């Protein structure tokens, strides 16, 4: 249905919330929050998140509406164009408790997103999962179910630089080239694996899967990337502009060296 563009700040917020709640109680607990972002048509972009206060009575947990309204009034002052989108939580697969809480959330917004983060996972992929509520009629009653959505990580130079600096934790051209040496090393180690799988399928080591060998053909056909005639005029425009800027930089540095040498010369060989 819709397309979701997640932000790493939301994931960091959820992780910090869970760590804080666990460190203050000595036992892991399930946390509840709220997501705010921008939606333009069918493109939902989750930007920020905040915490919510929930009260667990008997065996059902409820979300305090007045607290959420207070938090909405507070955050509308700072971020004006951001709007409520859905809620998040920590756990495994969706649960009846989650589908009960989703009804209370949906009482506020017509189509709220659901985000679930698994803090104790065992796979090699990000444990964030996004769901949307789809209602259905069956057996003579209405049941509301969860449909999974596919998300993509959003792009921003400031956010990317902050995330890289946080992840890493320790010449100016020997420190910029390493940030581009750790991303090519990840693309190469995937293209190599795809090539190995293709060769294994050719010589015969794994069952012949048609879908994978068709997607690999499409991937191969995708190169070169945009070699049109208009591209190799903008690219060269940029190259020549940077070349001229570099030329002027060297002229300025040579003028500085000029001045230094002339000053040092009009001391020794001065006869006036």
């Amino acid at each position: 249905s819709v397309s979701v563009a997640l932000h790493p700040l939301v994931i960091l917020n959820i992780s910090d919330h869970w760590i804080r709640m666990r460190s203050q109680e000595g036992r892991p607990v399930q946390v509840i929050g709220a997501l705010i972002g921008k939606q333009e048509g069918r493109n939902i972009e989750v930007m920020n998140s905040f915490e919510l206060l929930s009260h667990t009575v008997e065996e059902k947990i409820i979300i305090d509406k007045e607290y959420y309204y207070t938090k909405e009034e507070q955050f509308k002052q700072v971020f004006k164009e951001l709007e409520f989108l859905g809620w998040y939580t920590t756990g495994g697969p969706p649960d009846p408790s989650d589908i009960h809480v989703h009804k209370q959330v949906c009482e506020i917004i017509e189509s709220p997103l659901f985000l679930k983060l698994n803090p104790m996972t065992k796979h090699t992929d990000l444990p964030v999962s996004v769901f949307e509520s789809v209602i259905d009629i069956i057996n003579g009653e209405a049941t509301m179910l969860f449909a999974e959505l596919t998300y993509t990580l959003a792009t921003e130079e400031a956010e990317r630089i902050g995330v890289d600096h946080v992840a890493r934790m320790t010449s100016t051209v020997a420190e910029h080239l390493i940030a581009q040496h750790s991303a090519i090393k990840m693309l190469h180690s995937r293209v190599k694996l795809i090539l190995e799988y293709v060769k294994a399928s050719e010589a015969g080591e794994v069952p012949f899967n048609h879908e994978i060998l068709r997607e690999a053909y499409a991937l191969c056909h995708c190169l070169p990337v945009l070699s049109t005639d208009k591209f190799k005029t903008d690219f060269y425009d940029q190259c020549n502009d940077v070349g001229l800027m570099a030329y002027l930089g060297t002229i300025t540095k040579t003028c500085n060296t000029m001045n230094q040498f002339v000053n040092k010369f009009n001391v020794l060989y001065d006869r006036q």
Binding site: S171, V173, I184, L213, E215, A216, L223
Partner: protein, 213 residues
Amino acid sequence: NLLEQFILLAKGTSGSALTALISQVLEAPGVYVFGELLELANVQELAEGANAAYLQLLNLFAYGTYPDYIANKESLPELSTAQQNKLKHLTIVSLASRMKCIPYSVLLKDLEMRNLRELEDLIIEAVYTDIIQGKLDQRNQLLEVDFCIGRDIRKKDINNIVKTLHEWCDGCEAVLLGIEQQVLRANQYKENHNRTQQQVEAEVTNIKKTLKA
């Protein structure tokens, strides 16, 4: 999911029923790849018999283009309404696989169309099926393709995949080596320049010290 549904429906059928299922598969919308149907033993068994025409049709729909239904039109069975449109869509995909800026003249020639409006309508309805994604430029008469699906493959094309993936792997490795070399050279340059500066300063200090005589 349609192709596997038809394959399950064709687990044991053969003869006329298999040909009817083949025609229904070729007409069914959303099925633009027929490779798992071709791998079936009974489907491939149609060569020995009077039904080799349907096997030829399936091969044409899996690996061929619309102009190929210009020389084998007499031998092949009659093509339906939606089947011709599907073949034209697959021809568009085949053209877009090679080049990413398809001129209007090429599409008009191979797709066997006479009007610009008919061609543009066919391209638009092909885009709506999400087999290709692109934009139409009319001042320059081009179709700019940003994404296209991968059609079917033979057993003799995988060598090409290996060939064009080896080049990418080698290019990535050569870029990495160059990056490491540049880092090394820059560090060496910086170290040499500051060693020279510190040596000049040490010489000047020694001259200053010996000057006190």
